[PDB]
Structures are given as structure tokens and as C-alpha cells.
Symmetry: D2
Subunit: 445 residues, 4 copies
């Protein structure tokens, strides 16, 4: 029978909480979602509501677009608690968290113990980790942070009410890498007890590379200092994930956070907080005040059930292939223009070519190139000039955008992130070739 076949897949999902190997048909998925929504009290035929939060909906467009899931996730006192007024939404949350734990394993952190989706972006999710740690370490005021010029993760420390201690990176060839000795020197200077945590970063803009997590995990273990990893867009990278797995095996990592949109191709606004100590990850979840949106969870649930394990693995494989293609094409273009691809082997996602030939003419040509690319409908390229000075949440960054005060040259940043197509690379190369030719003609003529 037809219905029994659909029921079989749903039962499989419910029993073991795992991603199906092959993606579900839309028919099975929508049957499932409708069944779940039926379980929420706001959708009961015989329901009457006499409270202030009854999940009433004014607009049919709003009700339909959310599959009639209105109550959000959690209870008033606990985002992790089953909501008796919303049994279907509760199940939705539970299954989604289980699917995500599974995917974290698949992606390369096979020892992850606990995780939960939180409907806040990565910056605010990092903030939530810091807020949790306040209560564990009431003497702490500082967060030690190897520099990365990204405003959200920087602001996350300030928003939490802590003082970032910015550790400058070491130039090693073309790469900017973790200054482990500076990290330790700051721990000793300020005192371990006064450090809330070390806040490290994996996926990042080239020529920075993922932090030396193994060595940082050892430092944190030895000094008894929490270690929080900003894995914003590292889940899509087996290299980044293995770094986290290794870190956890050789030392201390207390939490790692990743963006839903950047790793699962869904709207901005959700993140996953994960870790190796279940009580601690639970403590972070319990720190969340109030109910929360179910919308990011629904998105990732729809996405993972539709892809299956095989679909997601395929996307990860294709990203690695696109990285190789992007790198080859960009090196070819760069060398044709008397530039070079910066040697950034430790960065698995992000690449950079030099812009030495247009820089140094005192005409803002690097910044102009970024503008020209943007007007030609290239998005996500970063034209990084030298000498930017910017103050962000109380800290003045010299060489802002380059993750160092004195990076040797201007460069252009491109990346092969999940869901990239050959057309993205090909149009980019074609448009970049044209823009470079235009700038050089202007500077020459």
C-alpha cells in the first residue's frame, strides 16, 4: 500500500532520529509536516484558547508559508523542553536537532556529544556561549581572540559584556596564522582566572587560515580555560571539521558554533551550538530566555530530509571540486595579468590573488575594482587594499580587512563555498578579466 510506504520512512526517521540515506520525495515530506502541524494545539479542530499566546494567525499567507507551525520551540523556562501546547513543533525541534547531530558526525566531528539549533545568527549564538560562561567564571573579564576582520564575531564578545584581547597573527609565507606564544603570553600576563575563554576561528577569509586548534586546545586544557570555536562556515569543510575533532582528542574544546545559512543553503538567521560535554551544551541551551522561532529549524529539516545523507555528501564533494576549479581558473587569470595566487594551502574554502599591478598608484584602484565587480553583478568578492584604519566596538584595527597591521600586498578574495556552480567561477573569471583590463588601461593611458 501507498500510505504504508510513506509511513515506513516517517517511522524510520522517528525511531532513530537519523538522516535518510536517500532524500525523501516532496510528497512524503509534506505529508510528514502536515501530520506534525496537526499535533499542535492551535490546529486542533475542537480547541478553544483563553490565553495570551494561543498561536492565533491573522493572515492565511503567514499560516500557510510556515506549514501552520505557529507556537515556535520550547517552553517559557526552557528552549529545550517539550511544549505541551505544541507537541508537533516539539517533535519538529527534537528531530531537527537529531538530524543536525548526525550531519556534524558525517561532516567530520564524529565524537560530538550534543547540539541544538538556535534561531539566532552565529554572532548572537557565540554571545549566548559567552553569557553562559559568565556564570561559570564570575571572576573573568577577558576573551582572548586571534584576530579576524569580521565584525559580527568581534562584536559578539563586546555584546556579551567582555573585553576582547586581540592577538595579532603571524605571517608565515603568504598565510596569517595563530600566534601561539602571544596567546600564552596574554594568559600569563592577565591570569588564567581572568580569562572567560579562548575564542578561536576555523573558516575565514584568505590569506588568514583556520586557527591552530590542536595547540590552542592543549593551552586551554593546561590552563583550565574554556575554548569556544567560531566554526561559522567550517562545517562544509572536512579539513575544518577534522581540526575540531583533533582539537577535542588532544585537548580542550567546550563549544563550537556554525551558521545554518552558510553550511546548509537556507535563509540567514539560524546557527548550531555543539560540544563534547552534554551537561555544558545543555547549560547553554537553558541560558536562552523564552520561546524561540521554529523557522530556521523547519528550513534545515526540510533541507536535510530533501537531500538525504547522499545529497549532502554530494554537495560537500562538489564544493571540494569547485575549490579546485576556482583555484586553477584564478591562478590562470592572475598569472595572465602578472599577478599570482597567494599560497594559502591551509585554507580549504577561501583563496586570494594579488592586486600589486593596480595598487600603489594613489588612486584607490583596489577599492574601485571591488566596486566595478559589484556593479557587474559579481557578489562575494573582497578587494582588500592596504592601510584601512577602522574602529569597531572600541577596538581600532590597522590594516582592517587584511587581519594584520602590515600585510605585504593588496589582494582579491574569492571562495568556493557550498552550492557554488561552474557558472559562478566562469562568469567571475570573465568579469574580473574585463575589470582588470579596464583599470590597467586607465592607469596606463
Amino acid at each position: 500500500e501507498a500510505r504504508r510506504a510513506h509511513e515506513h520512512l516517517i517511522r524510520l526517521l522517528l525511531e532513530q532520529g537519523k538522516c535518510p540515506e536517500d532524500g525523501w520525495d516532496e510528497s512524503t515530506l509534506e505529508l510528514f509536516l502536515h501530520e506534525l502541524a496537526v499535533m499542535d494545539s492551535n490546529n486542533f479542530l475542537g480547541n478553544c484558547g483563553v490565553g495570551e499566546r494561543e498561536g492565533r494567525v491573522a493572515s492565511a499567507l503567514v499560516a500557510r508559508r510556515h506549514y501552520r507551525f505557529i507556537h515556535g520551540i520550547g517552553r517559557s523556562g526552557d528552549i529545550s523542553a517539550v511544549q505541551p501546547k505544541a507537541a508537533g513543533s516539539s517533535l519538529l525541534n527534537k528531530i531537527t536537532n537529531s538530524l543536525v547531530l548526525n550531519v556534524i558526525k558525517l561532516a567530520g566531528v564524529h565524537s560530538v556529544a550534543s547540539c541544538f539549533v538556535v534561531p539566532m545568527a552565529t554572532g548572537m549564538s557565540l554571545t549566548l556561549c559567552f553569557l553562559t560562561l559568565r556564570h561559570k567564571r564570575p571572576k573573568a573579564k577577558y576573551i582572548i581572540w586571534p584576530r579576524i576582520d569580521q565584525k559580527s564575531c568581534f562584536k559578539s564578545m563586546v555584546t556579551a559584556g567582555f573585553e576582547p584581547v586581540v592577538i595579532e597573527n603571524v605571517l608565515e609565507g603568504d598565510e596569517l596564522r595563530t600566534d601561539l606564544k602571544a596567546v600564552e603570553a596574554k594568559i600569563q600576563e592577565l591570569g588564567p582566572e581572568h580569562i572567560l575563554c579562548l575564542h578561536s576561528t576555523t573558516a575565514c577569509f584568505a590569506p588568514r587560515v583556520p586557527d591552530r586548534l590542536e595547540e590552542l586546545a592543549v593551552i586551554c586544557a593546561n590552563y583550565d580555560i574554556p575554548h569556544v570555536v567560531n566554526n561559522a562556515y567550517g562545517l562544509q569543510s572536512s579539513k575544518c571539521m577534522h581540526l575540531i575533532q583533533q582539537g577535542a582528542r588532544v585537548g580542550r574544546i567546550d563549544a563550537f558554533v556554525q551558521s545554518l545559512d552558510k553550511n546548509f543553503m537556507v535563509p540567514v538567521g539560524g546557527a548550531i551550538i555543539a560540544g563534547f560535554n552534554e551537561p555544558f551544551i545543555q547549560d547553554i541551551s537553558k541560558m536562552y530566555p523564552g520561546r524561540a522561532s521554529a523557522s530556521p529549524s523547519l528550513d534545515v529539516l526540510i533541507t536535510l530530509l530533501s537531500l538525504g545523507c547522499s545529497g549532502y555528501r554530494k554537495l560537500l564533494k562538489e564544493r571540494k571540486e569547485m575549490f579546485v576549479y576556482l583555484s586553477t581558473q584564478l591562478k590562470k587569470l592572475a598569472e595572465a595579468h602578472n599577478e599570482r595566487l597567494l599560497q594559502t594551502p591551509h585554507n580549504p574554502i577561501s583563496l586570494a590573488m594579488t592586486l600589486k599591478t593596480i595598487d600603489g598608484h594613489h588612486d584607490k584602484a583596489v577599492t574601485q575594482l571591488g566596486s566595478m565587480l559589484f556593479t557587474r553583478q559579481v557578489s562575494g568578492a573582497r578587494a582588500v587594499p592596504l592601510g584601512n584604519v577602522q574602529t569597531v566596538s572600541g577596538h581600532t584595527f590597522r590594516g582592517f580587512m587584511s587581519h594584520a597591521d602590515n600585510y605585504p600586498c593588496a589582494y582579491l578574495n574569492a571562495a568556493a563555498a557550498i552550492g557554488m556552480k561552474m557558472q559562478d567561477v566562469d562568469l567571475f573569471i570573465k568579469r574580473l578579466d574585463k575589470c582588470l583590463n579596464i583599470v590597467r588601461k586607465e592607469q596606463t593611458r
Copy 2:
């Protein structure tokens, strides 16, 4: 011409940022949304993306349900900043914030200066206010809080890293009201400089009533202490809103926060932070780290454009009418069962009847009644027994659920919140009548 008529309404909205008096047809709304989504770079026909956040979407179900709005709101460094990669989503955010400012005025706070939608629930939004105030008042550690037994707003203070100072309420007739003298005694005891803010509450469970905001505003003004108002579900009440307006006219109110779901009949997960000092409200917004979901904003935009000013006013009028109906019906039922409606004239939304006839038999009958109602598909009723002891985020509440250590009696709580129908009251009354008869027969026989 047909298209020109639609364009006229869209232009009207764009020019003045105001709610249309009459609600838009679905056709106009969906034309508008599709036009806006077209403006986001991820939807450009000629686009190529070479970044880590390109708003790529894997599932067509996910893309469609969000009207192809994928980039969220804000920039990395600023949730209020226009996003050049998402011009349509930026406009969506700007218009939604303008519509909401207008509705706040319509609802009764005609002097509101600034507001923004934040895709977090009210608890976390209150937390964000406290996080902002940390930086203004680095010596402060305490938040003075007139007691209300609601876990989210309580946890919001703890999550922010502050010590709540719980002020017990005064029993005045049947009502529990603000103890102004206790509030002042604590300010003097602890020192104004050590108070982060006063955290007051408007809409609440009867027999508590909205806080004495005028008097609290004077205290805060005189002692130079910020005043943050938890208006979670008070926007739907002209009485609550006038209280805020009056508070701002006679003294100090720095921010007031309200729930999107509870006041606009949309999914849980969004809130509005509003105030009278634009730079300060802007400072709260700037404290948010990273981009955020556009989903709550889209929901309220769809809802407000569909209702128009007239539709929303109608809902507010109907809520007042349902309150009268609920009150009359509940008083009639109560008196028929030898109970009474508690005299709570200062509470415009929430009502309570006594449960003296089933209480005191040492059989947990009050709690049982709540269970019986729930199993009969009544949601949102609160059966409040005497003597609950509960510890929540480090504070032990005696008489938990009753907002006092020693409320004189057990009671049942019902409310007339926005979107309530006659059927809600009628089914509630019928089912409650039956449950009371059952409990009394059990206790009698």
C-alpha cells in the same frame, strides 16, 4: 490601467512608510513582495557569487515559502544598516520598522520616537536591552523587578549577567500591585549607581495588574536610573499603552519591548524594541552582533499590509468586546458554582475566578482541574494552586504562579487576547462547567 492602481498603493507605502487605511488585496501584496525579492542580489539573473554567504538555497520549498528572501536583515557590523547584497530585504526591513512605529502610535503611544523589529522573542530582546545598558553603567549589577511569575522575563535578567532584585507586590483588595516604597527602599539600600535599571511589566496574569508606570517613571527620573518596560502583550491594550505614554510624559522610560506573536497574531520568535530617545534605541540595535532573520519582519509586514489600519483597529475593538463577554460569562459561571470573579479592574486582558470550593481537600484538585481542562482541549487556562515552591535561575519563589508568597485563594485564569472568538469563550464556559461538576461530585461522593 490595472498595474498603475497597484503601483499607486506601493508608491504610497514607500513614500510615507505608513500603514494603508484599508488592507491591500493579496494580489497587490504578492506583486510587492516579488518585486522586492527581485531586488536581492541572490535573485539577479546575471549574478555570480564567489563568497561564503551568497544566499544560495538548496530546497525549492524553502525558497518559495520565504518569497525568495534569503539574505536576512542588516550587515555584519550593524543590523540597522542597508545591505548592498540585499537591497530588497533592506527595504523590507525599513518599511516594516516604519509600519510598526505607526502601529505603536495607533495603539496608544503617540510619542514613540524609534523602534525596530528584532527576530528574537521578548525575553531575549529584554536581554539585549540589559546588555546595552551594561556599557552605559559599568558599575551596575542589580536589576530591580516587581515580581511576576513568568520564567522568560525573569531569566532575561540572569542571562544578561545581572542579579535580579525581586520586589514583592502589595495586595490591594484582590489585586497584586507595585510596592513603590519597597522599590525606593532597595534603590537607597543598594545605591542608584549599582542599579542597571528598573524592569517593570504591563500586561500580566490576573490578579497581578500592570505596574504603576507613572510612579516608577518618576522614581527612575529622580534617581537617574534607566527604566525598561516589559510590554510583552500590552500593545494590544490601549490601557497598557496609555500607561506607557503617561509614564514617558511624567518621568523616565528608556525602552519598552513587546511580542510580535502576542500582539500581531504571527508565529512565535519576534519582538519590537521601542523608545523615546532615538540615539539610545539605535544603540540597542547596534549592540546586536551579526545579520538576523527577516522571517518575523516579513510576517508582520504581510499581516499589517493585509489588515490595514482599519483591520488592526477592528481587532483591538473586538478584543475589548471579547473581554466584556468573557468577564460576563465567567462571572455567571463562577457564581453558579458558588465562586466569584476576582475584582481586578486594573487588568484589561486577564481575569480570574476563585476555586475555593475545590481547594483545601488535600487532593491536588486545583492542579487536577487544569489537567482536565487541557485534556478537553481548553488551552491557555491557568489553574493556580496555593503553596507552590519553585527555584528559577537561582531565585526560590514561594507561592509560585500567584506572584505573591501568600495569595488568599486558589483561582483559575482566563484572558481575552487579540483574535479571540465567541466560540473560544463559549466552549471554555461549557467545558469548565462540566469539569467543576465532575470534581465536586468526586469530592462529594
Copy 3:
């Protein structure tokens, strides 16, 4: 339990095939439709297809918009037969036909024996009746037809391959009515055996009125001639339906046909063929070659389940009320302009006011008025001048649009059909007032 409540309604529908008294929630309806679609073999998870009609769909937009119902209705040899490849679509067809039989009863023909939805408009559905009758009456060549100036029902006879015999109407006061003596004179002239059927009409443009069905039913009974009734938009009228019921009680009516769009507020393209002799109605159905669209059936099923019996009755009641309102408003406007409402008491839907004051100036003012109304976004008004000559499918109509060669005056036609709102009448009156004033000023100045 939640799901059981939905199942109860679905089981009720399936058991007795009747319209629910109250309309289903959207949630129940969409649960039902998804369940039905699951039953169609094209939606089976384990299906493989090796035929030329597998219900494959290329576009997801197409699949979704039709709720994954792709196989249509019927088998190759029989539109009424259960389709083993599409059990869900078969059930959809069966239930829809049962719901429609019920509604025909509700609407006033309580003795209807059999009916089926056919995904053709009324003209083609009338054609199908005539095609069926060919085989019953191989000697017949003529269809006797009391005149109505509507091209579809006229063409239906020609398309079927028969010669219409146009019977002119009798002017009785302001009304144009059936010439019973002319009908009989033609039967005698041509011979009963050479008449395929009498083709009568109920709902029609004023000042024509529904045909004298009782008397025509007697004539047909006595002469042994089939009687086919064009009830295109008469189902919405209890007066029209009672006329059919009475006709069937006092004489012969073999089939009556009505438009889905005009009576159920759904897209154009479907009709219902109904009758009192089940074998004969079955014979009409069996005359249909091939499978047919399920789209009109799905539309009416969604519509009737959503309205319930009460919702549909309400619409019928509201139409009667709008007719009274339209009549009162139009009479008032007419008399204000020195015109009058034509006395057409036997027409329950359509009304006419005279246009004597603008007619007769040799300037095409009547036709101009129709154009002016149209440009001011009034649709469905008919400005009928005198003296139109038009040849339609071989027949030359003098006085075309007026259903007579020599109607005494020009007039404007307005109607109160199902789903009309007060705004329709009010805007119409306002716009008509303005247009008349403009024409008269032009003719005066």
C-alpha cells in the same frame, strides 16, 4: 486526539458522500487532498512506469498547484469508470459528483436522480447531450429553441450537427416569454420524429425570463420529444430550480446543464449534466471519449468542502438580498434620470433599466454608454441598442442582444449573481450616474 478529529470528518464524507453542514478547516481539506493524491500510482514511492500515460510531471509548479493529481478522471473507454492507475483521483471524482448531487437537491431540484461534472463549459456540455440523443433518434435533424441571444448555447446545437429552429419570444408587458403555440406549431409542421429535442433556457438576460418549463415539459411528454434545459446560471436561483423540479413533476425533462463558474465561483471551464433518468444520464457520460481533466472537479470539491452546506446556503441568501438591493438602487437611479426599471418579475437574477433618454439621437449613444462603463471598470453591464443585425453560425438575428426583432426600447442590463457585494452595486450606481450625466450633457450642449 487531533488526527482522529480530522479522520472523523473525512470518514463522514466518504461514507455518505454528503456536504458537511459546516465548512472544513483548510487543514482538514489539505490533509484529505494529500491523502487522496498519495493513492494515485504516479505518486507511489516504489512505482515504475513503462507506459505512454504515466502521469509524469516536468514542472514542480505544475505538480504542486494541482495537489499532485495528474491522471485526470475516468478510463479510456469510460469517463465514469474507476481508474486503477489513479484510485485517489477516482475517489475525488466520485465524491465530487456526490457533493454536487446533494447541492442540486439543496438548490431546489430535490428529485434529481443522477449527475456528473464534465470538464467542458456549458456550451460543449449541451453539445454532448445532443450528441448522445443523435443515437437515440437517428431520424431527427432539428432542435427547437426559444430564442436567447447568447452565442455559446446557440452554437452548441450547430456544433452537434443539428439545425436550430429558432422560436421567437412573445412580448408580455416588458418581458419576453416562451411562445408555446409557436413551439407546438413547429413540432406539428416538422414532425415529432424529426425533432432531436426541445432546448429551453432558465437564467437569462432581462427582459427575457426563464422559459415556461412546466408547459414545455407537457408538450415534450405528449409528443415524445426529449427536453434539454440550459440551466447555465440557474442553479444559484431557487426560482429557476423550482421551475425545473415542477417541470419534471408535471411532464418531461431529460437533462439539465449548469455552469460550474457561474454557480460555484470557480474558474471557467466546467459544467454539470444532471437528470431524472439514471440510465440516460449514464448514457451521456459514456458518450464522452477519453479521460478528462480533474481540475474543475478539484475546484468544486475544494469550494464545497470549504463552504459547507451552511456557507453555500448563505451565498444563495446573500444573492437574493443583493438582487433586492440592486433593484432598489437601480430603480432609484433610473427614475432620477427620467428612465424606469423594466418590469421583469419572472427574472430572479437579471434586471434592466430603459435608456430612452440617450437613444434615438443617431449617435450610437447606447453603445457609447457601454464603452464608457467598461473604461470606468464596470464589467458585466450590457448596453443593448435597438436594430443590431448579426449572423451567428448560419442564423441571422435581427435585434441581436435583445432576444426579439423589435423590442420597444434600448436598455441597460445589470444582474445580481452569486458572490456579488454591496460595493459592486454602489460603485456601479455611482459610475452609471456619472456616465449618464456626461452623455446627456454632450447631447444637450
Copy 4:
């Protein structure tokens, strides 16, 4: 600019009425459809309606699923006429007909002069052709028809009111082919003037093959007899289409009809009537009484714009590839079971393997095999036994399902039609292997 890019594609479509080479994004398509729907008067903001057909819609689900296209296609007197009440739907119809003419050319009939979509299935569409020809040839009573055991196309002649003259096929090797001499003998016997048309068939169940259209076109040309081609599922086949093109070049073909679902992967219920003489094809269109559904047209429009020319060509290519794969796999399976693939080179879509090893045991094993396949979720396979006698619309077919009285053996029919996947063939082969093994074990043990 973003919107301009979408406008460019829409303008391209509107100017030349041609299929885009590459498929449109969903965003462009839905922008277009919404723009078109805005043009229909029922969707005008300032509209008032005072007629009986105002395109009012009761259910929001119905309105939305049809993109607010409610008025259907055509005017009362003409399905081809622009509808002033529905300018958007009129444009929708015009563009769809233009796209389809283009695709007919692409598919292999490059000299097609005129075509139109009709929202009836192929049987009824054939009927419409015959109904048109009645008026051209009032002396005609017979339709000469080379036998094919398919009930719809057979019934189409009877429904139109004509006597089919069934011409038996010639067994040539394994193939059943047109008996040209029998066709001519009947023309001479009955008289050319008494023949309404020759009704030939292209795509068909093996071991029948497409009719000898070149030779039939010559016969029709010479005898002055219309030629109507049932191309139900031949459009997807360049072999079938070239046969039609050749027929038109060497003789007479007046019309050819094809199924929307079978060739374009959309719901059942639509067809395309096409021809080489524009006035005649126009005459067929004009024979349609009344307005008609726009739903099939919308489906094919969405489908063709989404695929583009390249997407449709790809599907045609893939069908040829799947035919080769199906043939190879079926021959391999057949020979493994001591059966053979019937030699049917002139049939490009449909294949047959012998069932001699299970036939002849007087146990209905062939029919049982068809049942067993069906219960194992194989659809579209035809198990054809010998000796079926069936009367269909007055004609008794001996050997029914085999297109001959005395086909030499029982066989199983499988086909590679458009949209077939490797999984369809692979599951079919696996399941067929199992079923054959089961039947043979039963017959052996």
C-alpha cells in the same frame, strides 16, 4: 538593473512568441504570471461586476492555485477571440499557442501553419475535428480507420455521430501495418463523397506501428477525402513527426492531434489540434461552443518556459536513449526466459516481448502476469493474451488488445515515453524477472 533583466526575457517572449532557448528561472516565470493575472478585470483593484460571469472566486486555495486566472479562454462566440474582460488570460492563450506552434516545428513538423490548445483530451479533440468536417461534407457518414485497440480514439468517431469503417491491419513479419489496398477498396465500395475522412494513427502499442501516412496522404489527395491524424503520443517522436511532415509534403493531411499530458508531462485533459491550412484549423477552433478552461494552457506554458527549447530537446534525446536502454534490457531478460523481443523497428516508442512460455496452459497466465506486475507497482505494462472478444461502441473486436483477429502469440508491451528514467526500466526488469519465475514455477510444479 535586476527588474530590467526579467523584463528583457518577457519582452523577448512577447515580441516573437517563441520558446526561450534556455529555461526561465521560477522567479521570472512567476513575475510574468502575476503581471498577466493583474491584466484580467476580475483582479482590477477598482473593478465592480454586475454580470453573471465575473470570475468571482469563493476559495482562496482555488484562486491561488490558478495564479488568479479565472475567466478561462475565448469569448462566448469564439474560443480564439481576445476576451476584453480578460486581457491577461487572452495573452496567456496567444503566447501558449505560439510556443506550441514553435515546439511542433522543433519536434519535426517544420511546415505546420496553425495550431491551438484545446482543454479537452485527444478523443474529444478528434471528435471536434469530425464535427467540423460534418459541415464541409454533409453527404458523408463513414470514417475509414486502420484498426487500433484504443477505446478513446475509436469512441471519438461514434461520439461525433459517424460510422467507423474498421480496416484490419496486415501482418508483416511481427509488425501490424496499414492495409492500403483495403483502405482504397472501402473508398471505392462506399464512394469518396460518403467518406467524412480517413482517421490514421501514429504512435501506438507495439506490435502495431505508425500508419503509412505518406501513402494514405496520396490516397486522400487523389480521392479528395480529408485526412485526420491521431498523433496522440507521436509529438515526442521525431520519427512520427517526420512521417507527418512527409505526408503533408507528398499528399493530404488536414489535421493532426496530440495529447498535452503524453508529450509535455502535464496533467491529463488537454490536446493540440494542428494543421497546414490555416483557414481550416481556424474553422475547427470556431466550432468550439463557449469559453474553455485555461488550466491546460497554463500548465504547458509554465512547462515550456521552464524547460526552454534546450530542456525540451534534452527530454526528446533522453527518451531516444531510454528506448535503446529499455530495448536492450528487455531483449536480455526475454532471451534469458526463452522468449524474444518482437521485431518492431517501425515503432519508435513501444516494444513487445513474447509470452509464449506461459501462454497456452488454459489458466489465464498472461492476464495473471499483468495483474502480478500491477500489484508489484509496475504501471503501464500491457499483458496481451490471445482471443479477447470485446464490443466497443457497437463494434465487436476479435483479438481485442492485439489490433488483429489472429496475432500469432501473446506478448507483453513496455514503452519508453518522455520523462522515463533508468530506474523505471531497472525496477521493471527486476520485477518482471521475478513474476515470470513465479508463473513458470506454478506451471511446472
